[PDB]
Amino acid sequence: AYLHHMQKGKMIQPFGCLLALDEKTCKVIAYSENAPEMLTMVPALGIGTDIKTLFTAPSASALQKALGFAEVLLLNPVLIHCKTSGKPFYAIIHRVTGSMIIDFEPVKPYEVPMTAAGALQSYKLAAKAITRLQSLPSGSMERLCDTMVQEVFELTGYDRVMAYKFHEDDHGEVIAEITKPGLEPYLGLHYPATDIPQASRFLFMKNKVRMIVDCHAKHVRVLQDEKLPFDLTLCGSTLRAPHSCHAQYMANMDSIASLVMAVVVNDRKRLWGLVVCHNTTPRFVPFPLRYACEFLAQVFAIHVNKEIE
Amino acid sequence: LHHMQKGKMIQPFGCLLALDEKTCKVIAYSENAPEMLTMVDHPALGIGTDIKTLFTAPSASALQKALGFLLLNPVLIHCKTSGKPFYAIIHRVTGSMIIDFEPVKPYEVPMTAAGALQSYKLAAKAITRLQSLPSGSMERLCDTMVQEVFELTGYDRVMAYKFHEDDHGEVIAEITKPGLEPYLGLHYPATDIPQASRFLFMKNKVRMIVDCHAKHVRVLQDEKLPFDLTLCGSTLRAPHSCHAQYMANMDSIASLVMAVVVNDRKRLWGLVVCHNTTPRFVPFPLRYACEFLAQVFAIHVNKEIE
Ligand SMILES: *[C@H](C)[C@H]1/C(=C/c2[nH]c(/C=C3N=C(/C=C4\NC(=O)C(CC)=C4C)C(C)=C\3CCC(=O)O)c(CCC(=O)O)c2C)NC(=O)[C@@H]1C
Ligand SMILES: *[C@H](C)[C@H]1/C(=C/c2[nH]c(/C=C3N=C(/C=C4\NC(=O)C(CC)=C4C)C(C)=C\3CCC(=O)O)c(CCC(=O)O)c2C)NC(=O)[C@@H]1C
């Protein structure tokens, strides 16, 4: 049941908007319902729209040029400007067979001159983290995980950061934790397997970093071309809305916002666990920082697998 | 020392402005800056020009904020009429804020963040390969460093150049494109690298020369400025004429040099030296990534001695 509704991914979070394009025609074959408002000035946006009508000439050309690379050759994000408004967005591209799917995340105008500076700064901080993991003496899973949650806490600014390990019966245990002062600790607690369905663990193998900005936000529908006789697969989107059971789960534990990083060993390939960030209030972090976190989690996974041996 | 610090020439691949640390107005500029930044009241660019007349408002605001600091480089700026974009690289000296401007292709502006992330990722992967090395073999450590830099930077030749106790140098590792003659193993006199150059490398850890044959450009300053403006910290500083000549005879038209400073007790261990047969330019984000790679390399060198 869970996998169907997560794979189709027809509901997104409202912090961004989504377009899907036909690789052959470059025209819009699906869009989220908030996309006309975000990207135009309400020359419309609908099924069949050409993207050269929406963005400035260098922007349209950069996206058009992405159509011609293999996915492993995609460099994200792309900085685009809207043609009428001048509004800037980060465009995050991925491919599913003959479709190109694009997530658009807003950028503040005063942030634009700092886009390269901020990207370098995020990766530099992550790189300094990697050196401290590596400097650590071997022999203690506990010290390794403490160092990791401490580094992530400083890098990401969330109220709570946990290392969550899966046991062989698939139930989980919180084995390391750092929080801001007032909060209730979860260190040492065990949780049922069913708190994280099989389908979610499966998706984490491919989508290694997941952000939920606000569990109470009103989700937005994706509309697709009525001519299509199948559903598009949108689960690779950075914007996919959380299933309502989990959004209800979040509100109950006063984690209004979250950032989760998969820890995949032998990347025998196995989901060892998760690094779980919670925030009491809504929180957004831009793509370059999440991208750096993905690499930090990869290196962490190498050290985890070393200690096992 | 006094025609590297008080020498007033830059390489022509970019241009330079210096601004007064209080008024924010132009107190020095390279002779190529008017055509590069305005396309040639008053001559649009001279002593006393206000940066609000040169750049779009978001661009000028971002530079005003930097004068208020802490520095994250580079800043992406657009010129006011042309919309012509540059990377602005900022540093401070006692009297002034100095800005090096390196051009960006207008149609590449959408990919600036993407390219910066990719540069740092490749350097971060190189860092993990150095770390995973079994300790004990200085040869293996240095061979790995030159291989990674070669792949990252795309230069024709990459060598590790070690300083001996008498300050003479030795090439102890090297990788080149096929068919180039090796220099591995050669010893060179201490005088090839004067002490003044060594002292600069302590502060400016990455130095790029795009084309030893390029015609250098003068920096003009107000003659009543109560101090002498130094260019030691500019990414654009011209090579000394002895070295421009030294490079031509050895068919290194372009170079990229990384200092290797241990106990960063502080001493210059050596250099990672990249050479190219033809002119070569690499953008600031890649040089910035190389700086961190060089610091991490220095730590492993220091470990090997001990
Ligand atoms: C509804 C009947 C059942 C249900 C479904 C469900 N859960 C998830 C996803 C996650 N569940 C967790 C669990 C935890 N988070 C924590 O912080 C802790 C320790 C305090 C636990 C145990 C996590 C981390 C996830 C991943 C969330 C993410 O991707 O950010 C899903 C998938 C949701 C989606 O839309 O991707 C579903 C469907 N949960 C229940 O408890 C019910 C039994
Ligand atoms: C002129 C009278 C003397 C002189 C001066 C001089 N040298 C440098 C700087 C450098 N010299 C070297 C030397 C080498 N490069 C190599 O590739 C090799 C081995 C194959 C050697 C021995 C290097 C690497 C530098 C640094 C250059 C840089 O910053 O990119 C300077 C500094 C130039 C400047 O303006 O910074 C000067 C003045 N060289 C001679 O040979 C004379 C004896």
Side-chain angles (χ1 to χ4, degrees), chain A, chain B residues 1-40 42-264 266-306:
Chain A
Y2 287 129
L3 201 53
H4 263 81
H5 194 357
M6 281 165 70
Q7 287 212 273
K8 302 338 174 171
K10 292 193 179 214
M11 301 305 293
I12 62 153
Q13 305 173 51
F15 72 92
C17 65
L18 176 151
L19 300 179
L21 308 185
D22 185 309
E23 148 153 46
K24 280 239 65 191
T25 72
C26 208
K27 313 207 203 128
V28 172
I29 63 172
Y31 62 96
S32 62
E33 280 191 306
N34 64 336
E37 190 37 48
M38 268 191 29
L39 300 180
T40 74
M41 288 223 77
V42 280
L45 194 170
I47 304 305
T49 293
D50 196 303
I51 65 171
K52 294 185 221 59
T53 70
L54 295 180
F55 310 120
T56 65
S59 283
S61 176
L63 298 179
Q64 185 172 133
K65 200 145 303 196
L67 290 172
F69 294 100
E71 192 168 21
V72 69
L73 299 186
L74 286 171
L75 304 182
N76 277 312
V78 181
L79 199 56
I80 66 80
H81 293 78
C82 298
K83 192 170 199 307
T84 310
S85 61
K87 273 210 280 173
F89 291 79
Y90 280 145
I92 303 111
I93 306 176
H94 71 276
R95 296 194 75 45
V96 177
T97 66
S99 306
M100 183 168 81
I101 306 165
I102 315 166
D103 297 312
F104 296 83
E105 305 181 4
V107 168
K108 298 293 222 140
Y110 45 87
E111 288 171 339
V112 173
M114 301 308 292
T115 62
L120 296 169
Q121 177 69 0
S122 295
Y123 224 109
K124 177 178 183 180
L125 290 173
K128 292 236 176 144
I130 286 160
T131 68
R132 289 183 296 260
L133 286 189
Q134 303 252 20
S135 70
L136 267 178
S138 73
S140 178
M141 183 64 80
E142 194 168 15
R143 202 171 36 235
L144 175 60
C145 298
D146 280 302
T147 303
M148 178 62 174
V149 301
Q150 232 167 310
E151 294 292 352
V152 168
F153 181 85
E154 286 252 321
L155 190 64
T156 66
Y158 284 74
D159 299 325
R160 176 190 304 279
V161 179
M162 296 174 292
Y164 186 96
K165 171 188 176 200
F166 293 117
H167 288 285
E168 168 46 84
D169 66 350
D170 300 299
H171 96 273
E173 183 186 354
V174 177
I175 64 167
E177 183 180 55
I178 185 170
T179 79
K180 291 186 181 176
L183 283 41
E184 164 169 7
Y186 302 146
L187 183 58
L189 302 184
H190 294 240
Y191 295 84
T194 54
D195 283 17
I196 307 187
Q198 171 56 44
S200 169
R201 293 179 258 128
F202 174 84
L203 277 206
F204 270 117
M205 302 298 292
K206 211 184 166 40
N207 286 46
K208 298 172 160 238
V209 177
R210 196 136 171 251
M211 185 172 66
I212 297 163
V213 172
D214 174 6
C215 64
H216 293 113
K218 260 130 48 155
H219 299 158
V220 178
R221 303 182 300 147
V222 178
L223 304 184
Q224 68 169 45
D225 187 350
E226 334 176 287
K227 293 168 313 277
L228 295 164
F230 46 94
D231 292 320
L232 298 173
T233 294
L234 304 183
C235 59
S237 174
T238 68
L239 308 174
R240 182 168 65 73
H243 183 296
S244 46
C245 182
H246 183 66
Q248 159 43 236
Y249 188 104
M250 288 177 76
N252 285 346
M253 308 182 33
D254 293 41
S255 64
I256 286 296
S258 59
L259 178 70
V260 179
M261 294 153 233
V263 183
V264 181
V265 293
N266 310 313
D267 196 8
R268 246 188 177 57
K269 183 194 280 146
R270 172 185 38 121
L271 183 69
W272 173 92
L274 303 172
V275 176
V276 177
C277 310
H278 291 170
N279 218 57
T280 52
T281 57
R283 182 161 189 70
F284 170 83
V285 293
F287 175 82
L289 183 59
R290 295 178 244 127
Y291 193 59
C293 283
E294 174 158 5
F295 189 62
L296 178 57
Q298 278 176 93
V299 172
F300 176 65
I302 292 168
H303 286 84
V304 165
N305 198 350
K306 189 159 199 62
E307 284 301 323
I308 291 167
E309 289 176 347
Chain B
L1 299 88
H2 188 256
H3 311 53
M4 273 164 161
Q5 200 147 321
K6 282 183 180 206
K8 290 315 172 76
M9 307 303 287
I10 64 159
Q11 304 176 51
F13 73 90
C15 69
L16 181 149
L17 300 180
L19 308 183
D20 178 74
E21 75 180 7
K22 291 300 308 162
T23 69
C24 213
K25 287 172 193 188
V26 170
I27 66 178
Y29 62 100
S30 54
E31 280 202 302
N32 64 339
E35 69 184 342
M36 207 171 261
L37 300 179
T38 74
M39 301 212 277
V40 152
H42 50 276
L45 197 165
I47 306 300
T49 294
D50 197 294
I51 62 170
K52 293 192 293 264
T53 71
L54 296 175
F55 308 123
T56 69
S59 296
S61 28
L63 296 182
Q64 291 180 317
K65 282 176 237 277
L67 195 39
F69 284 120
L70 297 183
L71 281 170
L72 304 176
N73 278 314
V75 181
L76 191 49
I77 70 90
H78 295 265
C79 295
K80 178 155 294 214
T81 307
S82 63
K84 189 182 184 353
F86 296 80
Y87 280 143
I89 306 106
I90 305 179
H91 71 277
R92 288 188 191 288
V93 299
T94 55
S96 181
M97 188 172 75
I98 301 182
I99 313 165
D100 296 313
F101 295 86
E102 303 188 354
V104 175
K105 255 172 95 196
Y107 270 64
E108 293 180 0
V109 166
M111 303 304 295
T112 54
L117 294 168
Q118 174 76 356
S119 295
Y120 224 104
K121 178 175 176 176
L122 292 169
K125 283 175 161 213
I127 283 165
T128 74
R129 285 181 294 258
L130 288 181
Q131 287 178 336
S132 81
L133 280 177
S135 188
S137 172
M138 186 62 87
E139 214 209 293
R140 271 219 319 254
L141 174 63
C142 289
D143 286 356
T144 300
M145 181 61 173
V146 300
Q147 193 176 162
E148 293 294 350
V149 169
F150 179 85
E151 240 161 71
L152 187 65
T153 63
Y155 284 69
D156 286 337
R157 172 191 310 279
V158 179
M159 26 177 183
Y161 188 81
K162 170 189 173 175
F163 292 116
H164 282 283
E165 304 156 24
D166 67 0
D167 296 318
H168 95 274
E170 177 188 0
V171 180
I172 65 159
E174 177 177 58
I175 183 172
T176 76
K177 287 183 183 185
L180 276 194
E181 184 175 39
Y183 298 152
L184 184 65
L186 291 171
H187 295 258
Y188 290 85
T191 51
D192 284 9
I193 310 192
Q195 197 217 263
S197 175
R198 294 185 182 113
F199 179 80
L200 292 216
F201 274 122
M202 303 299 220
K203 303 339 176 192
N204 313 135
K205 297 282 182 61
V206 182
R207 202 288 170 77
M208 178 178 72
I209 299 165
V210 170
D211 174 5
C212 64
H213 290 121
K215 171 168 162 30
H216 303 147
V217 175
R218 237 195 294 158
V219 172
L220 306 173
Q221 69 168 64
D222 196 302
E223 288 176 295
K224 293 171 305 311
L225 193 67
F227 58 76
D228 216 53
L229 202 87
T230 179
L231 305 185
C232 300
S234 172
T235 70
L236 298 173
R237 181 174 64 83
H240 189 286
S241 67
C242 181
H243 182 65
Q245 184 63 58
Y246 189 88
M247 292 178 76
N249 297 134
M250 161 174 15
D251 311 310
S252 64
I253 293 327
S255 57
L256 182 62
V257 177
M258 269 138 75
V260 181
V261 180
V262 293
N263 306 342
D264 202 356
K266 253 166 145 283
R267 83 178 194 79
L268 192 58
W269 172 92
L271 306 172
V272 179
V273 179
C274 309
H275 288 172
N276 218 58
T277 297
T278 55
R280 184 154 184 75
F281 167 88
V282 298
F284 176 81
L286 184 59
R287 295 177 242 125
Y288 188 65
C290 285
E291 179 160 12
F292 190 58
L293 173 65
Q295 271 168 79
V296 169
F297 177 68
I299 281 152
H300 284 59
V301 165
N302 202 32
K303 275 210 98 162
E304 276 300 312
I305 292 170
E306 286 176 9

PDB file of all heavy atoms in Angstrom, chain B residues 194-216:
ATOM      1  N   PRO B 194      64.161  32.677  -4.533  1.00  0.00           N
ATOM      2  CA  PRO B 194      64.673  33.594  -3.507  1.00  0.00           C
ATOM      3  C   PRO B 194      63.841  33.559  -2.239  1.00  0.00           C
ATOM      4  O   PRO B 194      62.673  33.162  -2.228  1.00  0.00           O
ATOM      5  CB  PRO B 194      64.562  34.972  -4.164  1.00  0.00           C
ATOM      6  CG  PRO B 194      64.263  34.725  -5.615  1.00  0.00           C
ATOM      7  CD  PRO B 194      63.758  33.343  -5.781  1.00  0.00           C
ATOM      8  N   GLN B 195      64.503  33.918  -1.138  1.00  0.00           N
ATOM      9  CA  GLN B 195      63.870  33.892   0.179  1.00  0.00           C
ATOM     10  C   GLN B 195      62.601  34.754   0.172  1.00  0.00           C
ATOM     11  O   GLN B 195      61.611  34.414   0.831  1.00  0.00           O
ATOM     12  CB  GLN B 195      64.934  34.229   1.254  1.00  0.00           C
ATOM     13  CG  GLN B 195      64.606  33.872   2.717  1.00  0.00           C
ATOM     14  CD  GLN B 195      65.119  34.896   3.721  1.00  0.00           C
ATOM     15  OE1 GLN B 195      66.181  34.740   4.324  1.00  0.00           O
ATOM     16  NE2 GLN B 195      64.405  36.013   3.825  1.00  0.00           N
ATOM     17  N   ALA B 196      62.616  35.877  -0.571  1.00  0.00           N
ATOM     18  CA  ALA B 196      61.457  36.774  -0.624  1.00  0.00           C
ATOM     19  C   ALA B 196      60.221  36.071  -1.175  1.00  0.00           C
ATOM     20  O   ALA B 196      59.110  36.289  -0.683  1.00  0.00           O
ATOM     21  CB  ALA B 196      61.770  38.006  -1.475  1.00  0.00           C
ATOM     22  N   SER B 197      60.396  35.226  -2.194  1.00  0.00           N
ATOM     23  CA  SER B 197      59.294  34.428  -2.723  1.00  0.00           C
ATOM     24  C   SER B 197      58.827  33.409  -1.700  1.00  0.00           C
ATOM     25  O   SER B 197      57.626  33.152  -1.582  1.00  0.00           O
ATOM     26  CB  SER B 197      59.703  33.743  -4.020  1.00  0.00           C
ATOM     27  OG  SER B 197      58.657  32.899  -4.453  1.00  0.00           O
ATOM     28  N   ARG B 198      59.766  32.776  -0.995  1.00  0.00           N
ATOM     29  CA  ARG B 198      59.404  31.813   0.042  1.00  0.00           C
ATOM     30  C   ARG B 198      58.564  32.462   1.128  1.00  0.00           C
ATOM     31  O   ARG B 198      57.659  31.825   1.686  1.00  0.00           O
ATOM     32  CB  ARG B 198      60.625  31.180   0.689  1.00  0.00           C
ATOM     33  CG  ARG B 198      61.425  30.316  -0.207  1.00  0.00           C
ATOM     34  CD  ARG B 198      62.484  29.705   0.632  1.00  0.00           C
ATOM     35  NE  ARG B 198      63.371  28.873  -0.156  1.00  0.00           N
ATOM     36  CZ  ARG B 198      64.639  29.179  -0.359  1.00  0.00           C
ATOM     37  NH1 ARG B 198      65.194  30.230   0.237  1.00  0.00           N
ATOM     38  NH2 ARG B 198      65.375  28.392  -1.140  1.00  0.00           N
ATOM     39  N   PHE B 199      58.929  33.680   1.532  1.00  0.00           N
ATOM     40  CA  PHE B 199      58.178  34.339   2.589  1.00  0.00           C
ATOM     41  C   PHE B 199      56.758  34.665   2.141  1.00  0.00           C
ATOM     42  O   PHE B 199      55.810  34.475   2.914  1.00  0.00           O
ATOM     43  CB  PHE B 199      58.926  35.608   2.996  1.00  0.00           C
ATOM     44  CG  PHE B 199      58.242  36.412   4.068  1.00  0.00           C
ATOM     45  CD1 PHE B 199      58.345  36.034   5.399  1.00  0.00           C
ATOM     46  CD2 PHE B 199      57.514  37.557   3.749  1.00  0.00           C
ATOM     47  CE1 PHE B 199      57.724  36.765   6.390  1.00  0.00           C
ATOM     48  CE2 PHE B 199      56.893  38.292   4.741  1.00  0.00           C
ATOM     49  CZ  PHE B 199      57.003  37.898   6.063  1.00  0.00           C
ATOM     50  N   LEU B 200      56.574  35.083   0.885  1.00  0.00           N
ATOM     51  CA  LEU B 200      55.220  35.330   0.395  1.00  0.00           C
ATOM     52  C   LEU B 200      54.360  34.069   0.456  1.00  0.00           C
ATOM     53  O   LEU B 200      53.159  34.148   0.741  1.00  0.00           O
ATOM     54  CB  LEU B 200      55.247  35.882  -1.034  1.00  0.00           C
ATOM     55  CG  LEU B 200      55.794  37.285  -1.309  1.00  0.00           C
ATOM     56  CD1 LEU B 200      54.985  37.929  -2.434  1.00  0.00           C
ATOM     57  CD2 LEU B 200      55.823  38.168  -0.053  1.00  0.00           C
ATOM     58  N   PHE B 201      54.942  32.900   0.135  1.00  0.00           N
ATOM     59  CA  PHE B 201      54.145  31.674   0.064  1.00  0.00           C
ATOM     60  C   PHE B 201      53.558  31.302   1.421  1.00  0.00           C
ATOM     61  O   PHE B 201      52.586  30.529   1.482  1.00  0.00           O
ATOM     62  CB  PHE B 201      54.997  30.550  -0.502  1.00  0.00           C
ATOM     63  CG  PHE B 201      55.005  30.498  -2.003  1.00  0.00           C
ATOM     64  CD1 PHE B 201      56.199  30.599  -2.703  1.00  0.00           C
ATOM     65  CD2 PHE B 201      53.829  30.354  -2.716  1.00  0.00           C
ATOM     66  CE1 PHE B 201      56.229  30.544  -4.086  1.00  0.00           C
ATOM     67  CE2 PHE B 201      53.854  30.299  -4.105  1.00  0.00           C
ATOM     68  CZ  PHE B 201      55.056  30.410  -4.788  1.00  0.00           C
ATOM     69  N   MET B 202      54.143  31.830   2.507  1.00  0.00           N
ATOM     70  CA  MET B 202      53.607  31.632   3.847  1.00  0.00           C
ATOM     71  C   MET B 202      52.232  32.260   3.952  1.00  0.00           C
ATOM     72  O   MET B 202      51.355  31.737   4.651  1.00  0.00           O
ATOM     73  CB  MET B 202      54.513  32.234   4.944  1.00  0.00           C
ATOM     74  CG  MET B 202      55.962  31.802   5.082  1.00  0.00           C
ATOM     75  SD  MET B 202      56.090  30.039   5.443  1.00  0.00           S
ATOM     76  CE  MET B 202      57.409  30.001   6.659  1.00  0.00           C
ATOM     77  N   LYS B 203      52.017  33.370   3.247  1.00  0.00           N
ATOM     78  CA  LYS B 203      50.789  34.113   3.416  1.00  0.00           C
ATOM     79  C   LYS B 203      49.791  33.838   2.311  1.00  0.00           C
ATOM     80  O   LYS B 203      48.618  33.583   2.583  1.00  0.00           O
ATOM     81  CB  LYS B 203      51.130  35.592   3.224  1.00  0.00           C
ATOM     82  CG  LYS B 203      52.166  36.309   4.059  1.00  0.00           C
ATOM     83  CD  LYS B 203      52.609  35.778   5.420  1.00  0.00           C
ATOM     84  CE  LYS B 203      53.740  36.711   5.896  1.00  0.00           C
ATOM     85  NZ  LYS B 203      54.514  36.177   7.095  1.00  0.00           N
ATOM     86  N   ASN B 204      50.266  33.816   1.071  1.00  0.00           N
ATOM     87  CA  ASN B 204      49.466  33.558  -0.124  1.00  0.00           C
ATOM     88  C   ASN B 204      49.708  32.142  -0.602  1.00  0.00           C
ATOM     89  O   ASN B 204      50.704  31.875  -1.271  1.00  0.00           O
ATOM     90  CB  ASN B 204      49.768  34.578  -1.205  1.00  0.00           C
ATOM     91  CG  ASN B 204      49.763  35.968  -0.658  1.00  0.00           C
ATOM     92  OD1 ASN B 204      50.653  36.759  -0.959  1.00  0.00           O
ATOM     93  ND2 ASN B 204      48.781  36.272   0.195  1.00  0.00           N
ATOM     94  N   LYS B 205      48.840  31.222  -0.234  1.00  0.00           N
ATOM     95  CA  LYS B 205      49.196  29.819  -0.287  1.00  0.00           C
ATOM     96  C   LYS B 205      49.020  29.254  -1.692  1.00  0.00           C
ATOM     97  O   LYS B 205      49.591  28.205  -1.988  1.00  0.00           O
ATOM     98  CB  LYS B 205      48.286  29.000   0.638  1.00  0.00           C
ATOM     99  CG  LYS B 205      48.372  29.334   2.119  1.00  0.00           C
ATOM    100  CD  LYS B 205      49.597  28.750   2.794  1.00  0.00           C
ATOM    101  CE  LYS B 205      49.596  29.092   4.291  1.00  0.00           C
ATOM    102  NZ  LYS B 205      48.403  28.516   4.977  1.00  0.00           N
ATOM    103  N   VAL B 206      48.254  29.935  -2.560  1.00  0.00           N
ATOM    104  CA  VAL B 206      48.025  29.523  -3.940  1.00  0.00           C
ATOM    105  C   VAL B 206      48.317  30.690  -4.868  1.00  0.00           C
ATOM    106  O   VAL B 206      47.776  31.786  -4.693  1.00  0.00           O
ATOM    107  CB  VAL B 206      46.571  29.039  -4.117  1.00  0.00           C
ATOM    108  CG1 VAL B 206      46.306  28.544  -5.543  1.00  0.00           C
ATOM    109  CG2 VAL B 206      46.242  27.949  -3.082  1.00  0.00           C
ATOM    110  N   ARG B 207      49.141  30.447  -5.883  1.00  0.00           N
ATOM    111  CA  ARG B 207      49.589  31.488  -6.820  1.00  0.00           C
ATOM    112  C   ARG B 207      49.422  30.966  -8.245  1.00  0.00           C
ATOM    113  O   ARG B 207      49.902  29.867  -8.567  1.00  0.00           O
ATOM    114  CB  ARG B 207      51.056  31.844  -6.542  1.00  0.00           C
ATOM    115  CG  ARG B 207      51.516  33.216  -7.035  1.00  0.00           C
ATOM    116  CD  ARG B 207      51.668  33.323  -8.532  1.00  0.00           C
ATOM    117  NE  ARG B 207      51.876  34.709  -8.962  1.00  0.00           N
ATOM    118  CZ  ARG B 207      53.016  35.380  -8.865  1.00  0.00           C
ATOM    119  NH1 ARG B 207      54.102  34.837  -8.322  1.00  0.00           N
ATOM    120  NH2 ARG B 207      53.075  36.622  -9.345  1.00  0.00           N
ATOM    121  N   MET B 208      48.723  31.727  -9.081  1.00  0.00           N
ATOM    122  CA  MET B 208      48.465  31.368 -10.470  1.00  0.00           C
ATOM    123  C   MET B 208      49.055  32.385 -11.442  1.00  0.00           C
ATOM    124  O   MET B 208      48.890  33.591 -11.252  1.00  0.00           O
ATOM    125  CB  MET B 208      46.969  31.235 -10.737  1.00  0.00           C
ATOM    126  CG  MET B 208      46.622  30.908 -12.186  1.00  0.00           C
ATOM    127  SD  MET B 208      44.826  30.701 -12.469  1.00  0.00           S
ATOM    128  CE  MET B 208      44.254  32.414 -12.315  1.00  0.00           C
ATOM    129  N   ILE B 209      49.743  31.884 -12.478  1.00  0.00           N
ATOM    130  CA  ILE B 209      50.230  32.691 -13.597  1.00  0.00           C
ATOM    131  C   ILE B 209      49.609  32.157 -14.894  1.00  0.00           C
ATOM    132  O   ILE B 209      49.762  30.978 -15.227  1.00  0.00           O
ATOM    133  CB  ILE B 209      51.761  32.708 -13.688  1.00  0.00           C
ATOM    134  CG1 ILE B 209      52.368  33.314 -12.418  1.00  0.00           C
ATOM    135  CG2 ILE B 209      52.195  33.551 -14.888  1.00  0.00           C
ATOM    136  CD1 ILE B 209      53.856  33.061 -12.250  1.00  0.00           C
ATOM    137  N   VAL B 210      48.807  32.987 -15.562  1.00  0.00           N
ATOM    138  CA  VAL B 210      48.069  32.466 -16.702  1.00  0.00           C
ATOM    139  C   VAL B 210      48.960  32.353 -17.941  1.00  0.00           C
ATOM    140  O   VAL B 210      48.862  31.373 -18.695  1.00  0.00           O
ATOM    141  CB  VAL B 210      46.829  33.339 -16.951  1.00  0.00           C
ATOM    142  CG1 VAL B 210      46.177  32.981 -18.270  1.00  0.00           C
ATOM    143  CG2 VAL B 210      45.810  33.183 -15.772  1.00  0.00           C
ATOM    144  N   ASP B 211      49.857  33.320 -18.157  1.00  0.00           N
ATOM    145  CA  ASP B 211      50.659  33.361 -19.379  1.00  0.00           C
ATOM    146  C   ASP B 211      51.894  34.217 -19.145  1.00  0.00           C
ATOM    147  O   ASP B 211      51.792  35.447 -19.154  1.00  0.00           O
ATOM    148  CB  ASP B 211      49.818  33.898 -20.538  1.00  0.00           C
ATOM    149  CG  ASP B 211      50.624  34.111 -21.839  1.00  0.00           C
ATOM    150  OD1 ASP B 211      51.836  33.769 -21.930  1.00  0.00           O
ATOM    151  OD2 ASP B 211      50.001  34.640 -22.784  1.00  0.00           O
ATOM    152  N   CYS B 212      53.061  33.573 -19.016  1.00  0.00           N
ATOM    153  CA  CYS B 212      54.293  34.309 -18.722  1.00  0.00           C
ATOM    154  C   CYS B 212      54.600  35.357 -19.797  1.00  0.00           C
ATOM    155  O   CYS B 212      55.391  36.259 -19.545  1.00  0.00           O
ATOM    156  CB  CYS B 212      55.489  33.378 -18.510  1.00  0.00           C
ATOM    157  SG  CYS B 212      55.974  32.416 -19.927  1.00  0.00           S
ATOM    158  N   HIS B 213      54.039  35.241 -20.998  1.00  0.00           N
ATOM    159  CA  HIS B 213      54.345  36.217 -22.042  1.00  0.00           C
ATOM    160  C   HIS B 213      53.368  37.385 -22.089  1.00  0.00           C
ATOM    161  O   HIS B 213      53.427  38.169 -23.044  1.00  0.00           O
ATOM    162  CB  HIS B 213      54.413  35.554 -23.430  1.00  0.00           C
ATOM    163  CG  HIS B 213      55.611  34.671 -23.602  1.00  0.00           C
ATOM    164  ND1 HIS B 213      55.518  33.326 -23.909  1.00  0.00           N
ATOM    165  CD2 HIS B 213      56.929  34.928 -23.420  1.00  0.00           C
ATOM    166  CE1 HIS B 213      56.733  32.807 -23.956  1.00  0.00           C
ATOM    167  NE2 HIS B 213      57.605  33.756 -23.658  1.00  0.00           N
ATOM    168  N   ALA B 214      52.389  37.445 -21.186  1.00  0.00           N
ATOM    169  CA  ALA B 214      51.368  38.478 -21.282  1.00  0.00           C
ATOM    170  C   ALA B 214      51.953  39.838 -20.913  1.00  0.00           C
ATOM    171  O   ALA B 214      52.866  39.952 -20.091  1.00  0.00           O
ATOM    172  CB  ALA B 214      50.183  38.170 -20.368  1.00  0.00           C
ATOM    173  N   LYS B 215      51.423  40.880 -21.527  1.00  0.00           N
ATOM    174  CA  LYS B 215      51.916  42.218 -21.253  1.00  0.00           C
ATOM    175  C   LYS B 215      51.257  42.710 -19.969  1.00  0.00           C
ATOM    176  O   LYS B 215      50.036  42.885 -19.916  1.00  0.00           O
ATOM    177  CB  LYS B 215      51.625  43.115 -22.447  1.00  0.00           C
ATOM    178  CG  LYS B 215      51.871  44.577 -22.252  1.00  0.00           C
ATOM    179  CD  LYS B 215      51.829  45.274 -23.632  1.00  0.00           C
ATOM    180  CE  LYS B 215      51.639  46.783 -23.516  1.00  0.00           C
ATOM    181  NZ  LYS B 215      52.223  47.321 -22.253  1.00  0.00           N
ATOM    182  N   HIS B 216      52.056  42.938 -18.940  1.00  0.00           N
ATOM    183  CA  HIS B 216      51.521  43.358 -17.653  1.00  0.00           C
ATOM    184  C   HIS B 216      50.945  44.775 -17.683  1.00  0.00           C
ATOM    185  O   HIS B 216      51.173  45.555 -18.602  1.00  0.00           O
ATOM    186  CB  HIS B 216      52.596  43.209 -16.584  1.00  0.00           C
ATOM    187  CG  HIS B 216      53.115  41.807 -16.495  1.00  0.00           C
ATOM    188  ND1 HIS B 216      54.421  41.504 -16.169  1.00  0.00           N
ATOM    189  CD2 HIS B 216      52.503  40.623 -16.749  1.00  0.00           C
ATOM    190  CE1 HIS B 216      54.575  40.191 -16.178  1.00  0.00           C
ATOM    191  NE2 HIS B 216      53.432  39.633 -16.541  1.00  0.00           N
TER     192      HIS B 216
END
